[PDB]
């Protein structure tokens, strides 16, 4: 498995070739280069996994070179591979290859074809760097490259300024998250003296024996970086606006790479969070609140992609809740399954927006189950996996593992939040499906993987993440029964509300608290307005106030004083001889008086 | 031995460029080309033969090469040149920028091209003399002699779209700022020399002899203040900064003149070389003031850059913010922060040179600099918007470029010393990403906001493309492998840091 660096090099080679080609190549050649780069990365990933399982799941290390060596500051360019890294790398490469093939079919006849595939190749390379890094600075390089490619891909259609504004907002919010992550890096290097994950875990208990404040600061800042990248509380506002990009961009962001980076960051530095239990409980609380707010926002969204955005936010909140209840394996399994069905849902939504030919809200569409039966089937199974349909969907098993972890660690409020979030998840998902639809090889692969066939795949996290506290069989069985009952009740309530003629739904919507709650939850609980008022508006006001460069004028004040003093002094040069004699006598008086005084 | 030739080859080359103009108008550009080729080759030969990676830290003074020749023996003044890792790195950077400036002014067929090349060569020779001189009078002499050709270039060859009055005003403001600050530095130098003469009894302007000077707390503060006023004017440090956007705005339109002398790389070298070793206690006492001035510089430069309708002024304020980062790094006493300052300085030189070259190329394309008059230029050009996108990504501190590497070692060392200024500086990094994305959106994205950007534009020439791609390759290699640069300057940085922290 010594070709571990090829998983970075091949997307990098593809990105460089497709960038310097500048779109002069044919679309077939550009598609071949991009999809072949990601497919060769996926094939090398498959061979790496085969050699990993053949060698007995041994953590492999490939040190390429040394990044920077200044005294004790030794940061190496080393790749690592364990079960978590293999799971993340396989998910990223496989789902990215499927999305690349679908985009090669999808983006035909579009300007910037080579540019699009170069940007996605750089995205894949950046996330492979992120998930293969052995220290925090190389992971930061992959982190910021992932953010940069997100900026380049959200505002892909640069002619529309709305896409550029959305990309700028996404990059600024994720840059605030990366600044929090940088704070975590600074604290961890200042305390432990290293940024390698294994060494930080090893020397964390030996160093924080006397005082344990800076470790909570570092883990809190790590959580801030994670919620910056994973679109969680309080930095979740960028995703819904970032939906302005192309469909494969949205699938690659919400399913495979972008939002899973925070979950991988929390799972990779799990030991430091284990020594800071309050911060881990804060991770769980942030996940619960974010999934609840995302479900409430998705309940009233009028567009398919906005519903999918808040569903992605809710699922990532479920992962964060799983991490907060020390259900790490449940979190990574849900990451895999959510990547599968969210990619399937986004590609099906792109098929819907190709069939509709115009940007329309969900109410204008109706009765689409007969015009597009394959797309309707894909949407139906993606919604069933998202809503955790029992015994047929992998999302059901992932959510059951998450809720079992919530049970076994004594977390009751997080369990209640999870069940409520599952109920509203089924509610908004089948609300969208019943509103829209009543009134191909990547698609086949994601069709299969969204069912229990995806649940057949388990991540090899033994020996990497700690094994969860084991629930009793009766408690696990009644929790599975409760989860299935809640999901079925939510789906049936959505059918009772939106499948027929909407009279109870419109009566609630036409109530004055209906207007208030619909307008509140439509704008993501006012967080976008709050960040506009608290941060954007004073920034713009200070920029407008400072655009005249006041310090430059303050330092130009001596020039004005010199000009005024020179003009005042030139009044003595009136050219009158009698005044010159008078001035000489005045100076004689002044000199004589000064000599007499001193 | 090669240091006098390192200084004199630009001067002799400029004289030959001026005198050989009678053989044709296409002759002096070649003469400047082998002039900077010889200068860069001498710098690289000194790099190869210096053995800088194997050099340990032996304390100030520790020079890899030295030259001494008496100039004014009445005051103990000599042409005293010395090179170590830091000075060699900056001489290599100056030679590379001189090569790029000769290449960027290749198509100028002006009637007085020989004098333009002479002024460019004399500016570069003055900058190299600043980096090499370890005599205080000689250092001040180079520091002030690099200003007259700069003044004449800005005043007489400058931005032809603007009036001559605006160019003369900007050049006069730059000259007054730099020369008044230099005179304050000369007063500090004279007072230090006289104090050393009163303490010991030998006339000497030598930097090695003035290191050990018994000085009261309060005289040392005043001398450090004079040195810091000079360096802060040419750093730039707020509020002594506006000469830099005014000089960048009214510089000649080639863009070579921007790379020649208006790029700031000598003041932080002077702070590391002279302000910290000569006055360690005064610098330690002044460190909170300088670090807060750096914080104010970062935030003020970012807000200034966002509020610009001119792209060249935006790049100038980007330089202001980055140099505020370097100023924070200098007054920390951390070897990690100093090495990060060196990497950030080299990377800022490369990235600012690329941005200024691309802005100049855009100006010969569209004949305007207003970002309100351009938009959607990604579809109208071939190479320029993608390279400008890369350089804007570089200037916001993205990993993969040397800017991130330098500024992150700066922030690591600063947080090891001072946490609060470090966190405010990282919010300044957020602001840097904000203004870089704002300039990218206002310049190359969107629709055409005027008629000059509506039609297709001619592609970039092969020479300009080759030098811009050389800058791109150098920035990427510095980001992914800064280790030769860190090994070159490790001994000098170690000596400066050990002197700063072992005498306070
Ligand atoms: C983050 C992405 C993953 C990294 C790969 C791509 C990075 C960017 C590519 C351009 C910059 C490359 C800089 C390094 C070039 C190789 C030189 C090198 O690193 O030598 C060090 C080492 C040998 O010296 P050693 O003494 O072992 O060093 C350790 C310190 N004592 O050398 C070795 O031990 C051998 C190392 C071989 C590495 C080969 C990598 C080839 C990459 C080709 C990329 C093509 C696209 C480039 C542009 C991409 C976009 C920026
Ligand atoms: C490293 C692994 C990942 C880890 C994270 C890394 C994060 C940082 C990575 C930074 C890389 C650069 C990103 C920003 C610049 C992107 C430029 C771009 O958009 O290129 C596309 C463009 C072609 O697009 P198109 O619109 O079709 O062409 C216009 C013509 N009408 O292309 C062009 O017009 C031509 C190419 C322009 C410049 C491309 C980027 C240059 C820098 C990378 C390669 C450097 C050279 C390789 C060798 C390095 C040294 C060994
Ligand atoms: C059961 C409560 C949730 C379902 C519901 O009644 O939703 C109504 C409304 C959102 O429904 P909407 O899709 O906006 O309206 C379709 C008809 N115009 O939802 C609302 O107006 C908010 C209802 C909040 C109830 C607490
Ligand atoms: C932050 C405090 C601590 C640090 C202090 C550092 C001090 C030294 C470095 C800063 C020097 C600042 C110099 C300010 C003036 C620069 C030149 C300038 O702005 O000129 C503008 C103007 C010429 O242009 P224009 O406006 O077109 O006028 C045409 C008039 N027919 O000019 C004119 O019309 C007249 C110009 C007269 C000459 C310039 C003014 C000299 C004044 C004394 C300078 C010495 C410092 C004194 C203290 C400064 C404040 C601390
Ligand atoms: C131009 C305005 C004048 C600037 C120079 C002021 C000089 C001054 O007031 O010096 C007073 C004092 C002299 O130093 P002293 O403490 O007497 O040293 C012997 C024992 N330490 O100096 C001190 O004690 C140190 C004073 C440092 C700050 C003075 C300069 C501020 C410049 C702001 C711009
Ligand atoms: C999350 C809550 C918890 C707190 C954590 C820290 C704070 C995080 C806050 C994140 C807020 C991000 C908001 C980003 C909005 C971007 C979109 C936007 O407003 O776009 C409008 C405009 C577009 O830019 P332009 O290129 O001019 O467009 C051309 C035509 N419009 O864009 C502009 O004009 C530029 C707007 C720049 C906004 C800068 C934001 C700076 C944030 C500083 C954080 C400081 C944190 C510490 C605060 C004190 C704490 C005690």
């Amino acid at each position: 498995m010594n070709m571990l660096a090829l998983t970075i090099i091949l997307p990098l080679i593809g990105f460089v070739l497709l960038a310097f080609s500048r779109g002069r190549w044919s679309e077939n050649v550009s598609a071949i280069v991009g999809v072949g780069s990601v497919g060769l990365a996926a094939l090398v990933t498959a061979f790496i996994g085969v050699d990993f399982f053949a060698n007995g799941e041994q953590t492999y290390s490939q040190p390429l070179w040394t990044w920077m060596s200044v005294g004790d500051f030794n940061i190496g360019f080393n790749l690592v591979l364990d079960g978590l890294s293999l799971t993340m790398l396989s998910v990223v490469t496989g789902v990215g290859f499927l999305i690349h093939m679908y985009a090669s079919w999808y983006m035909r006849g579009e300007e910037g074809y080579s540019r699009f595939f170069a940007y996605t190749n750089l995205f894949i390379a950046s996330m492979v760097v992120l998930v293969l890094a052995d220290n925090l600075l190389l992971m930061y390089l992959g982190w910021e490259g992932v953010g940069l490619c997100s900026y380049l891909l959200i505002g892909f259609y640069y002619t529309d300024p709305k896409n550029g504004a959305a990309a700028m907002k996404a990059f600024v919010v994720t840059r605030v998250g990366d600044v929090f992550l940088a704070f975590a890096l600074f604290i961890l290097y200042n305390e432990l003296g290293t940024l390698n994950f294994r060494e930080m875990v090893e020397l964390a208990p030996a160093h924080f024996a006397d005082g344990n404040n800076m470790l909570m600061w570092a883990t809190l800042m790590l959580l801030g970086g994670a919620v910056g990248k994973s679109a969680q509380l309080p930095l979740q506002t960028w995703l819904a606006d970032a939906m302005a990009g192309p469909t494969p961009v949205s699938a690659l962001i919400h399913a495979a790479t972008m939002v899973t980076a925070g979950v991988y960051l929390i799972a990779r530095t799990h030991g430091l969070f284990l020594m800071t239990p309050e911060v881990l409980h804060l991770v769980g609380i942030v996940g619960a609140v974010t999934l609840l707010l995302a479900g409430f926002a998705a309940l009233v969204q009028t567009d398919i992609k906005r519903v999918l955005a808040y569903s992605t936010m809710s699922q990532i909140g479920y992962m964060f809740l799983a991490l907060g209840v020390q259900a790490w394996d449940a979190a990574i399994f849900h990451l895999m399954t959510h990547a599968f069905f969210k990619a399937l849902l986004f590609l099906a939504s792109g098929s819907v927006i190709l069939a509709c030919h115009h940007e329309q809200n969900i109410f204008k569409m109706g009765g689409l189950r007969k015009s597009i039966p394959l797309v309707y089937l894909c949407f139906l199974v993606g919604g069933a996996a998202l809503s955790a349909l029992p015994l047929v969907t992998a999302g059901f098993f992932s959510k059951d593992e998450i809720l079992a972890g919530a049970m076994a660690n004594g977390h009751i409020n997080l369990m209640v939040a999870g069940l409520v979030g599952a109920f509203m998840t089924s509610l908004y998902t089948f609300r969208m499906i019943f509103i829209v639809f009543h009134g191909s090889l990547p698609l086949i692969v994601l069709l299969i993987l969204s069912t229990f066939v995806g649940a057949l795949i388990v991540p090899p996290l033994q020996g990497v993440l700690p094994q969860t506290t084991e629930l009793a069989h009766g408690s696990m069985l009644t929790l599975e029964i409760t989860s299935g009952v809640v999901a079925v009740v939510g789906i049936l309530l959505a059918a009772w509300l939106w499948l027929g003629k909407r009279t109870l739904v419109t009566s609630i919507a036409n109530s004055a608290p209906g207007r208030l709650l619909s307008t509140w939850w439509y704008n993501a609980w006012g967080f976008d307005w709050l960040y506009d008022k608290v941060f954007v508006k004073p920034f713009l006001g200070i920029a407008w106030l400072l655009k005249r460069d006041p310090l430059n004028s303050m330092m130009n004040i001596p020039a004005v004083l010199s000009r005024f003093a020179g003009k005042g002094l030139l009044l003595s040069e009136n050219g009158y001889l009698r005044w010159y004699v008078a001035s000489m006598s005045i100076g004689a008086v002044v000199v004589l008086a000064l000599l007499m005084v001193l | 031995m090669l240091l006098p030739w390192l200084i004199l080859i630009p001067f002799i080359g400029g004289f030959l460029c001026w005198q050989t103009e009678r053989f044709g108008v296409k002759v002096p550009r070649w003469i400047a080309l082998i002039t900077m080729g010889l200068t860069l080759a001498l710098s690289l030969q000194l790099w190869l033969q210096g053995g800088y990676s194997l050099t340990q830290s032996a304390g100030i003074p520790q020079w890899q090469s030295e030259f001494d020749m008496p100039w004014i023996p009445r005051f103990g003044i000599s042409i005293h040149l010395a090179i170590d890792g830091l000075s060699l790195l900056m001489v290599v950077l100056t030679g590379l920028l001189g090569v790029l400036a000769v290449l960027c002014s290749w198509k100028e067929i002006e009637k007085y091209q020989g004098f333009f090349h002479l002024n460019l060569m004399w500016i570069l020779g003055g900058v190299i003399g600043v980096f090499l001189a370890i005599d205080m009078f000689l250092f001040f002499f180079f520091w002030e002699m690099m200003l007259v050709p700069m003044y004449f270039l800005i005043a007489l060859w400058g931005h032809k779209a603007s009036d001559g009055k605006t160019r003369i005003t900007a050049a006069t403001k730059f000259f007054i700022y730099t020369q008044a600050s230099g005179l304050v530095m000369l007063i500090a130098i004279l007072a230090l020399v006289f104090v050393h003469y009163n303490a010991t009894g030998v006339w000497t302007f030598n930097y090695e002899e003035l290191l050990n000077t018994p000085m009261s707390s309060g005289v040392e503060y005043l001398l450090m203040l004079g040195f810091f006023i000079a360096f802060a004017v040419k750093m730039p440090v707020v509020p002594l900064h506006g000469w830099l956007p005014d000089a960048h705005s009214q510089a000649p339109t080639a863009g070579s003149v921007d790379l020649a002398g208006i790029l700031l790389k000598t003041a932080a070298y002077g702070l590391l070389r002279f302000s910290l070793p000569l006055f360690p206690n005064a610098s330690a006492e002044f460190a909170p003031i300088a670090m807060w001035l750096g914080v104010i510089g970062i935030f003020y430069g970012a807000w200034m850059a966002f509020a610009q309708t001119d792209i060249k002024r935006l790049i100038a304020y980007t330089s202001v913010s980055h140099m505020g980062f370097v100023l924070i790094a200098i007054y920390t006493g951390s070897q990690l922060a100093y090495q990060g300052a060196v990497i950030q300085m080299i990377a800022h030189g490369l990235s600012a040179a690329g941005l200024f070259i691309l802005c100049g190329q855009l100006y010969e394309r569209i004949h305007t600099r207003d970002m309100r008059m351009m938009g959607g230029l990604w579809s109208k050009m071939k190479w320029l918007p993608a390279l400008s996108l890369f350089f804007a990504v570089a200037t916001l501190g993205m990993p993969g470029t040397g800017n991130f590497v330098g500024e992150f070692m700066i922030l690591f060392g600063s947080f090891q010393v001072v946490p609060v200024i470090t966190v405010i500086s990282t919010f300044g990094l957020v602001f840097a990403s904000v203004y870089s994305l704002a300039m990218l959106h206002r310049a190359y994205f969107g629709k055409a906001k005027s008629q000059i950007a509506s039609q297709e534009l001619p592609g970039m020439s092969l020479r300009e493309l080759f030098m811009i791609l050389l800058l791109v390759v150098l920035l990427v290699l510095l980001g992914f492998y800064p280790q030769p640069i860190l090994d070159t300057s490790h001994s000098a940085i170690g000596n400066i840091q050990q002197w700063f922290v072992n005498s306070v």
Side-chain angles (χ1 to χ4, degrees), chain A residues 223-500 502-513:
Chain A
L223 168 58
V227 302
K229 191 65 66 186
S230 273
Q232 300 289 285
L233 211 76
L235 294 141
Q236 82 286 340
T237 57
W238 62 275
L239 207 60
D241 301 344
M243 293 293 346
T247 280
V249 169
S250 301
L252 210 63
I253 282 180
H254 300 64
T257 87
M258 176 72 165
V259 294
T260 70
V263 188
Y264 169 72
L265 174 67
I266 302 300
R268 175 59 66 193
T269 77
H270 69 272
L272 312 174
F273 276 99
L274 278 178
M275 321 183 21
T276 54
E278 296 284 339
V279 193
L280 204 51
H281 196 52
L282 184 54
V283 170
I285 287 173
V286 157
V289 171
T290 313
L291 82 97
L292 284 181
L293 294 203
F296 271 109
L299 197 57
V300 305
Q301 282 307 309
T302 64
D303 204 359
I304 304 181
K305 55 181 183 60
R306 306 287 292 264
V307 165
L308 289 178
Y310 288 113
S311 77
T312 298
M313 190 182 306
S314 171
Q315 293 319 294
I316 297 292
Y318 263 108
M319 326 216 177
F320 269 68
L321 178 131
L323 297 160
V325 302
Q326 327 222 351
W328 322 88
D329 316 37
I332 305 306
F333 181 58
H334 194 36
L335 199 149
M336 196 198 351
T337 61
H338 161 75
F340 291 156
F341 65 72
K342 194 53 71 189
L344 172 63
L345 274 171
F346 267 114
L347 303 194
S349 70
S351 299
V352 163
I353 211 57
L354 293 182
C356 200
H357 201 266
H358 193 268
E359 184 262 335
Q360 308 279 135
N361 52 323
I362 61 176
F363 297 118
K364 291 303 171 298
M365 278 102 102
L368 264 74
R369 58 176 169 176
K370 298 171 296 181
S371 300
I372 57 200
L374 276 89
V375 194
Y376 169 64
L377 156 79
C378 293
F379 246 89
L380 186 72
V381 299
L386 173 61
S387 51
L389 203 62
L391 302 175
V392 286
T393 58
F396 176 69
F397 296 98
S398 71
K399 282 189 182 180
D400 289 342
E401 286 199 13
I402 292 181
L403 291 176
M407 217 73 273
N409 286 275
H411 288 103
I412 308 301
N413 299 328
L414 301 183
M415 170 181 69
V416 169
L419 267 325
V420 168
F423 172 72
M424 330 198 49
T425 295
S426 61
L427 192 54
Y428 68 67
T429 315
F430 276 80
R431 167 243 190 200
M432 179 247 300
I433 288 179
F434 291 155
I435 282 184
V436 166
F437 290 98
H438 294 83
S440 293
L441 187 128
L443 289 180
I444 288 303
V445 171
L446 293 174
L447 221 33
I448 297 175
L449 285 174
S450 296
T451 56
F452 52 89
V453 193
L456 291 179
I457 305 177
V458 87
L461 303 164
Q462 300 295 320
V464 180
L465 300 169
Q467 217 287 12
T468 322
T469 40
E470 265 289 358
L471 202 58
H473 210 53
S475 299
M476 169 211 123
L477 198 299
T478 191
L479 186 59
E480 287 188 350
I481 287 299
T482 312
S483 176
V485 155
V486 154
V488 159
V489 153
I491 293 164
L492 286 180
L493 205 174
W496 181 56
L497 278 196
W498 285 284
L499 213 278
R502 270 93 73 170
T503 50
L504 177 53
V505 183
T506 56
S507 303
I508 296 180
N510 293 332
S511 52

Side-chain angles (χ1 to χ4, degrees), chain A residues 145-183:
Chain A
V146 152
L148 175 62
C149 297
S150 142
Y151 159 71
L152 287 175
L153 278 170
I154 284 155
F156 173 71
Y157 302 117
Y158 53 89
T159 62
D160 191 17
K162 288 206 325 322
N163 316 344
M168 190 166 4
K169 178 181 180 64
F171 193 79
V172 163
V173 170
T174 54
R175 209 74 162 88
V176 173
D178 298 4
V179 153
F180 291 163
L181 181 58
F183 292 158

Side-chain angles (χ1 to χ4, degrees), chain A residues 65 67 69 158 175 546 549 552, chain B residues 173 300 317 396 446 479 483:
Chain A
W65 64 83
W67 201 359
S69 181
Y158 53 89
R175 209 74 162 88
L546 288 190
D549 206 352
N552 188 33
Chain B
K173 175 181 184 180
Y300 191 80
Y317 285 126
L396 63 95
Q483 204 48 55

